[PDB]
Design a protein around this nucleic acid. Sequence first.
RNA 1: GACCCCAGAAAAGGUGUUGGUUGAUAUAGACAGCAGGACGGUGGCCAUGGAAGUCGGAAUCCGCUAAGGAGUGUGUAACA
Lengths: 52, 141, 161, 202, 190, 196
Amino acid sequence: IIEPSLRQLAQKYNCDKMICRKCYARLHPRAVNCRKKKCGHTNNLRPKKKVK
Amino acid sequence: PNEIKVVYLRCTGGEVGATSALAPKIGPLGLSPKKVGDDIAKATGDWKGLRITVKLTIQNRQAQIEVVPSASALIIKALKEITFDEIVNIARQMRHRSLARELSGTIKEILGTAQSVGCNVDGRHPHDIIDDINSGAVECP
Amino acid sequence: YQTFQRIVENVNVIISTYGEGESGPMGNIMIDPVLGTVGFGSGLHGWAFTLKQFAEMYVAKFAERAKKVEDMMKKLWGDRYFDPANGKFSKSATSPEGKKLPRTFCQLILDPIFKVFDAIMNFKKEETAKLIEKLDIKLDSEDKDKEGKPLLKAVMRRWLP
Amino acid sequence: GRRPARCYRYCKNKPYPKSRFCRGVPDAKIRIFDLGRKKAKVDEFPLGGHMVSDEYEQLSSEALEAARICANKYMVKSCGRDGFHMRVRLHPFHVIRINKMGMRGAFGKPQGTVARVHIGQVIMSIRTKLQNEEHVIEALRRAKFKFPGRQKIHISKKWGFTKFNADEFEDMVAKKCLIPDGCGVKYVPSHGPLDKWRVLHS
Amino acid sequence: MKTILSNQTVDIPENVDITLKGRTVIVKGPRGTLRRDFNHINVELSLLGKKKKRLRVDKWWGNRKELATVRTICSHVQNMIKGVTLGFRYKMRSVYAHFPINVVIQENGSLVEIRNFLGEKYIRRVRMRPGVACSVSQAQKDELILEGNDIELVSNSAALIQQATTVKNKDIRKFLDGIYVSEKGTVQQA
Amino acid sequence: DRATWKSNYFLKIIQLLDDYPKCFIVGADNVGSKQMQQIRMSLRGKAVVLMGKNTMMRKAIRGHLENNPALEKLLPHIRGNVGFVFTKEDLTEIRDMLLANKVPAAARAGAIAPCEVTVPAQNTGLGPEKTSFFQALGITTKISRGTIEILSDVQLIKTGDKVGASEATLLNMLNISPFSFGLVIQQVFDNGSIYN
RNA sequence: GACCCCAGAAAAGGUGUUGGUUGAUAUAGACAGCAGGACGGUGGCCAUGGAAGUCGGAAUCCGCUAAGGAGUGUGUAACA
Ligand SMILES: [Mg+2]
Ligand SMILES: [Mg+2]
Ligand SMILES: [Mg+2]
Ligand SMILES: [Mg+2]
Ligand SMILES: [Zn+2]
């Protein structure tokens, strides 16, 4: 029953992000390369899946 | 509201069907027609077109005048059973002529291109007509 | 008040769209707090109320008994506002000076309940004392010694069965 | 059922083709070497793209088949089923043996076929429309992952699969130094009988 | 490749006054003082005019790794300037699905008290950075106003509150509740 | 085709600006293409509306019109989203005819609202399934005659604020026209002259 | 990381930095940002339980145009 304006506010920090395909790292929505060296800064990124 | 205004459209025509028509889902909005109104709804919209025949219906208390918006592919498929050069011209005459048109060569081109699905005048697809538009290009006004 | 309005609106909208038997064969069926068809309370805490009891007691503190309380029944619900400093109702959303006032439902129904709940819940002993006599509720056994939520359990039940 | 390709990667065994001495050889995995429009004449496909392999290794027959399929799926999907012709320019002629389970009489029996490549040698060829160059490079780039070694993509200066350069191809065809038939062209030297010059050029 | 020189300049308003002690910038704006040393980098800092008061940094043979620090310093100095003329105010709302999040602001706005987060009995106490004061606003139903002069301290304290209310072992695409930064503005709105 | 198109626009602005001596400098505000589509048609009998990049205009009528000066006064005026309406008839008529051709624009989500609109207490006529929209904005509505009813007139949107996403769609269903605006003239031109 | 034999590594990746090749855009104002518009025939044809630009088979036009794909993705049962 969260009001939608605060609902979008929370999704900005919890849901709207990109995930590295090699190390599952949570990256900002505009990320093109993973920031972690454990995967070698791979560009294999995917959006975080929605609950819809 | 014009003593009734239940303007909604419907995408059936040709064969009456009635039950095969989507009218039961669209019936409650007017609350007038029901099954008897549906039967008279297809009566005038029986022929021309014999096809999808999308119509915009203006209400008449219980009756419903079935004026059909002259859709391009609707009239093209209705006429096609083929030159129809003058017939495509009259088909390009009665409809509203908005088209974001400027002249009569424009509408001859735009309506000419819409009928690519069902060819055009005898042995030529309706695109090589579009380039050299001179014959009757100003015959409507 | 908002969530109460949302629910009754949600109940009314679903009554009308499927209950096609509107004014006609059974008349108007939709529930309405002003009509008295909706009540508030909590079965766990054994206390409940509706707009009648508050309107009935406000007149008592204020045959013919029926007509006068149904008009105040109307005043309690809705967007009608009440000014405490003026000590009267008002349809304007703001006072003549410019002080916006609470609506009538929250002002004269919920405030005493909110005052009752907060006083007992926070163990403000003197406030419970002044409240019970201002509310004129009979004191039975086993509550003069037990405080807190069980006391709130008792005073609400006794005041509003 | 098949050993890793690393066991037969290197050309170290003195070419051993299927012959009257090497009998009982199983059939190679790759039987088709030309795909796409093998009938396009010479002109609609002037762009030729090659996969040259800069390593002296041998590629197996199943790898050649796998890369051919991989290039066919992409070229059909992107350029269309009729917009390209593919030619695998490698044939798995060398036969590799296996000594099945000690070292006495260790000469193995045939088990598969490989193709031996050199530093400069095309593995695959694609001819297509000119505007499909990016699609050809990508299709070759993907098929390169199916081979053990390192390979390069090269857009050849020659017209399609023809051995003559694309810039001068049109004008010798114009003056009839080349006549087109089939997928390629016929060179016409000016040193035959004169009657054959006059059935041409007329 | 080493550039001959990479430099850029920042303007200093009339009200705020900047003094230099080596690579240590001190700002004396109306809302207090801000001081920050930069001796971890090798640049030169200079005040240019006496009337327009321009602060200039140079790099003098840096590669692109340390060329990036020229505008990092100037951005920090601008943050110092804005922090002493307008201050930093980080409004942040508390969103909850079912359980209201009760925040109690203890002594002089330096300690905040997150009570009913997801209906747990554990009280979360987070201490604001020195020079950062948090408060409960009266304009909105539930949101924290933490103001200050240092953006690094104010934003870090806002991060302390946000990371304190983190849902564990649940689907965080649901259970979206917590306290998050809504807007980052200033004071005096000028 | 980029070089051809850019040159063609140079020819178009050249051979049309030679013909029409009267012009208005007109700004393209939040103006839909469909509603520009009809004004172009609506003025098609009287004038012609042409514009493009303001840099395109600036280089067009500064370097190729040394033959006919007095259009240099257009140079400091063609700024921002600006346009030319090229007319041959009297300026006053096409002025009010432009003002007469206004559009009842809807409310797009994210757009600012310079005008104030507030829904009164009337029977909307909408079915008993759209209550949840009035729930989202806090309007207390009980249904009468099988139709949604606004009990008391409630403020809808104030000037100079952001339209809510659920708010903007609500105005569409109510069919009530929100803030609406279209083509607006700024300056005028006739043989080296400027007015309001 | 650190020296023939030699005592340890591959395919494959990096928006970490350095050099190189090739191509392209850009005062007729690029790039990136912030802000507008992003239309009609046409809910284009055949498939349909409903497929309206976006599950698919094909076709790939016209007019207004500064420009707008008979559609890049999200989204819907379809819309929106
Ligand atoms: Mg093994
Ligand atoms: Mg050997
Ligand atoms: Mg910045
Ligand atoms: Mg779990
Ligand atoms: Zn990663």
